[model samples]
Target: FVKHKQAKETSALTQYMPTSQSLLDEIKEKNGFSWYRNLRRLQWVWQGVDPIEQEQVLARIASSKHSRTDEQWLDTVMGYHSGNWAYEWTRLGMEHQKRAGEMTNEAASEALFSASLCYSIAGYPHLKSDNLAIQAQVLANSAYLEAAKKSKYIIKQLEIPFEKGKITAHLHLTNTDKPHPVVIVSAGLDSLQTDMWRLFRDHLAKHDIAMLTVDMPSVGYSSKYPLTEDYSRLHQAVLNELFSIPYVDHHRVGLIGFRFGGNAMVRLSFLEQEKIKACVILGAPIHDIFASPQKLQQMPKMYLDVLASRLGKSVVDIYSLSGQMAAWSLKVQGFLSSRKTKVPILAMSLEGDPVSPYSDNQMVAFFSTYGKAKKISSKTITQGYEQSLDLAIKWLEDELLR
Candidate 1:
């Protein structure tokens, strides 16, 4: 079934099976496959880090073979070790700051934001030692807040209260005092709030759109909250907060989510359709990841491990968990089961995404079932982020402005 689905989605450019081993092995032949895969999947990281700096990091990593130790991993992936990861990124961040000492504040601010991205990536997976993870988070939060303060744009660090604690968000506003259309960006499963912020910040701002990027319920610092049926409510909390903001136009709120954020957005859109003006779903898994035993067996270990961590379950229990996953569906949750509103929607996916094998069809299924959108569109792309993002941003601008 997985193979069949992949074949259906496959195009000239998106020609590949629903498997990770082949892709990993192909990149492994080039060295730094693990690090490169992470970079490729989360390409938005490049938007924050300087292009020259990112190229240098990639070149250095490619020069080495498979890294086994923490130190070696740092050298290869920029950050993968515990304490060492934090130190390396922090050190690099300091270097960038030093170089920008006599430069313009805009340059300085950009430098600081770059450093913060490194620190957050260092703490990635956030599965390392508890102290080191916390340290990385603290450093990332501090650097980002500092960067926001230095920025010429209207960027503010928010601490919106939640049941567990507070959801950290970076709200980028327009320079004009008038209320602006707001776009809520949901962080991907493995992404930090910084990732989405960097990706959407300039794009949204250029079109006079304000952006509120946040770490969702089960991801990043927001992981303080356990995953629950109420996961979708966190987004509502964000929406409610936006409504309170003086510069946020309540009727012009939009939502945009990618990957894990995409799934969460789908669920949230169902519950919050009345509040959101338009919604965009990018590469989200709207169907069960392990809908079949073959598909379950074929799933990449890294993917399963991430899911397990989110569920607070040991990987050993993945088999039993697969049963539960197989039975779950977005249709049953609400979106496809019934149309509660005619809110505009733009769903997009890569034609042959191994991470989301049947996601294109998933969008089709949901849209077909719901069928009440003032405007509904879906795009299956062969190229990656560049084209996909352009399509998304254009569609969103058109929908929101209309």
Candidate 2:
């Protein structure tokens, strides 16, 4: 171990190494060994539900872990007790909607929110097949649109201008005073704006911050663009429209990106640093995506598949275009360490993030490279999304108050 440490120190890529590789190694040992990467994915689904509801949910999915194929695995996740993943979750969603019909607006909104969550979960299987992906997205969007209508807070469906078409987003704010501080929330490759709201809405509301949850380009309701390095332009346009809103405090705005969204946010922070205040990049892939040929190839096939599909390319082309994609990295673009940045950044990653592996190292490297000129902080979360949310709140508060 001592010799290995020494070897890393002498290497050119040492700066990209984690503050401690053991930290990265530990998470991998705990969460990266499972087949189909079910454990971490389950952690993802579990984060969506309220804590009180997870026990029953866990019990429901626990019996089905022996699933082998993709269909079987999704079935197990949807839970056998529910009958089928999409069918059952949608059924439960309807029950909640029906219950909401007999209750107050708040109750209706909460129930509709749960329905959206279920339908979104059910939308995953459809994503694997091109034929049903759009259909799945439509159903999920319908549920979410209903939820937005019933929401207690001011959650408006937005149609921000993009290239030829418009970008879809949910602008969420409390009925507070004028010029509220805003945070642009961007979801990753597989997640939607609805998912972003479920994860971070309460924390933002508690801090008296308004949020704009936008779908990442090429997925969800956003305009379809090839999954390339030029996504900052799309987000930049969204920010332009957001800043134009009458009640938004144009100067007091920040951005939060999750997973792939993190990748976009990092790039945007470099591109539009003067326009934004702070950034929180959670469970994002930075170094891993741009590190080496081996690292890029090592990325999970499911992720690659989605990437290829979104990029409108074959898996072979995805691999072929990796070098082109790597050019988008902050390190590669000479932005990470070359100049001081005004935007403060807070990046967080789980120790054993199965989908975005080596996140500890990736985040630590980012902090080291980008921390010198900014109030940057990076955390390795071993717990769950709750902890990540707490960190996000703290980061946003610092940016908002400072």
Candidate 3:
């Protein structure tokens, strides 16, 4: 076991309901990366993966390697067939790709999008130097472009200028009939801009809002930029670029971010208060997790790799990583602990989340005028995911349309 302190502070975490089917379900292992596969079932399903195929993928992964060596290995995939993560996912991606060729209209586009999401997930928690993940990401982006080409909705490929080069973004719109209220969306360090299509199609589009999806710095299209304390810089530039985008109502722009992107969005809300009408953050590591080195050490190999890769560390000093991470905490940076921002931020997380503690949401709420902190019921977290997103859209709609 990784040596760490056993906290007696029961009050810090909300109680988990054992009887209910929850998104928090996982395969518990004291050591090794084998159980990591079980962690993302909820997220994968939320990304539109078929539950049956998901089980098939897990089964293939489990049966592929019999030896104990595969259990401990983080970077190595044993065989190309059932053994390799990218292999199996890429196989499904091709199947969807083939189906899209036979289909018509939205069905074809939807199939291609599904393929894209699968390939992107195949590169899950993508590390910069991981060759296999990089390949999967390329396939993912290619499939995404093809999907956008066939889709009925408008997806403008954006090349927003930033720091000498350009950052790519996908701006999804139901139509450009009139300037629509826009929401800038971002996913965490482990996810990409392509993963948010469902968020746009299902939630934001229903509310008559245009969705602009961007990747966090050091991941996806923004990979050239190393992650820093100033995590929102690229997104801030994107926010500024919206002024010239004729199809979006720049004055009515809102922000919605997941995980680390949430931290970035919250930071943006403060920095560009006049430009942002509302903000929503989900399970963001805005405080304590970054402040405590002990907590940081408890993260899985995939997470550590993502952090290390994003921070541009070739040889990681695991101990020093936390010190570097300390600056990321909004509280430590005096953003949350001090004065308030005018932006009405809706900060939320699942009830028992380790990274985005309920207290962090409360602190964010305490610091904004109309800000609210919410705990989605993790006990029934499938419902929680739907409801929370529904709430996220509603929050944005209320403010952006006001």
Candidate 4:
């Protein structure tokens, strides 16, 4: 191990970093210029390090850019880190896109996937691209890679039949004799295929939990379609389907919906009734707090701008069924307040996440409306969503186990 570490350090990472050598050789053998396969290897090496190291590496790459071609620069950038690989991949992908430019949906999907994967790990600023189409591609590619790599449980694709179009969901099931609870992870506008939640599966598995995840109507696989009049119906369809699957104990099932899913999950608890044993809301917005859109519009543009920024490209029209509080269903309170299933309510929020403003009076009303929940139930107000997520996971470990 010591020798191996030393060899890695001595090796020309710019020329011989570890990646799919076969894939690189194939690209080279078929097209020649195998030397270029080492493209941006130095940049990738820098990126593979910590954040401080990343800046130093980037500065070096910038200095060298004047002498090298863009492709060479990009390869150096990608050679060290996976994200840079994404960038190189995206740049190379433009050629295929042009060749298959016949407006064919099938062709488009393939090209998009290629570029998206390239952009996924390619470092920053591409994350700020105005191209919505490319954004979707990055999301799909990253999730696909994460699921394929980390999942020890059963991972299956789901086709949800909506009135408008089908919803694509990725489902993961644990093969265990013991009755482990289930969680349906909800996506936000930008959370599509982000590897962040993909990491959570392992964390949840510590509690023997399995999860099924769906693209929130406006994001990911479902981004091509419109949100339903009742998103809960969709959530119910998932529960109903998972319940029927072999070896799944449906009664012990639960949900942990993050961001927009927070409100959706709560309404789903009421809409589906006895089906859900636990409904965890992470970073849900206090949608109903602002009584009027006119009033909401009157607020500072910075607030509205920040709100739009959070949702990515989705318009407010998609969320606002009537106004600011639109995404949440009327049944959110009744479900939490009800005796059905003793559904333990776990609502989490950030100190100033802007998306779920902590100071809203309507938020206060929503909390009080729950009336009485289990003493063991938790209400977490943390520094931020990521911190809140860590706590929520820990809370779930303790609660679901008991």
Model 4, global lDDT: 0.47
**Which residue runs of candidate 1 sit more than 4 Å off their true CA positions?**
1-46, 58-91, 128-133, 288-297, 332-334, 358-383
The best candidate in terms of TM-score: 3
lDDT of 2 at 253: 85
- The lDDT values for all models are 0.60, 0.59, 0.80, 0.47
Give the alpha carbon lDDT tens digit for every residue of 1-402 in model 3.
011112111111123234211312221243445544325788888878888987887667556653322354422344344456666777888899999999988999999999998899777767676555677899899999999999999999999988887989999999989999999999898888999889988888887799999988888999988787788999899998998899999989999989999999999988988999999999999897999987676665456656777888755556677678999999888898678889999999998889899999999998987999998885577777887898898888788989
- lDDT order, best first, reads 3, 1, 2, 4
Worst 10 residues of 2 by lDDT: 5-14
**Pairs clashing in candidate 3?**
none
Error of 3 at 395 (Å): 0.5
How well does candidate 4 match the true structure, expressed as C-alpha RMSD?
A: 15.8
Backbone atom clashes (below 3 Å) for every candidate: 0, 0, 0, 17
Which tens-of-lDDT digit does each residue in 1-402 have in candidate 4? Answer: 112211211111212223323333343355444222223333232212234433543445444432232342323332322223333334443443454355344444344433333344332212222232244365546535443443445556678676677767765556667655777778444445442333344367666676777756545566555455465666677777765565456776777776666666766765564667666665565354333555444433223332343334333331242264443533343433433434555665545445555443133224432312211223432124345556667656655555
lDDT tens string, model 2, 1-402? 112211110011111124233433443455454332223344444445444443344444444543323332333232223333343445555666677778777777777777677666545422433322344456667776787777777887878766678787788887557778888888777776777555545678776688888877677776365555576667888888865787678888888888878777777777777778888777776555565654554554444445555555522443454555677565665655555456777776665554345543344335432431112233533245667667777877887756
Evaluate model 1: give its TM-score: 0.77
Runs in model 2 lying further than 4 Å from the true structure: 1-47, 50-84, 125-133, 314-325, 354-382
* Lowest lDDT block of 10, candidate 4: 3-12
> What lDDT score is found at residue 393 in candidate 3?
83
The predicted structure with the larger lDDT, 1 or 4, is 1
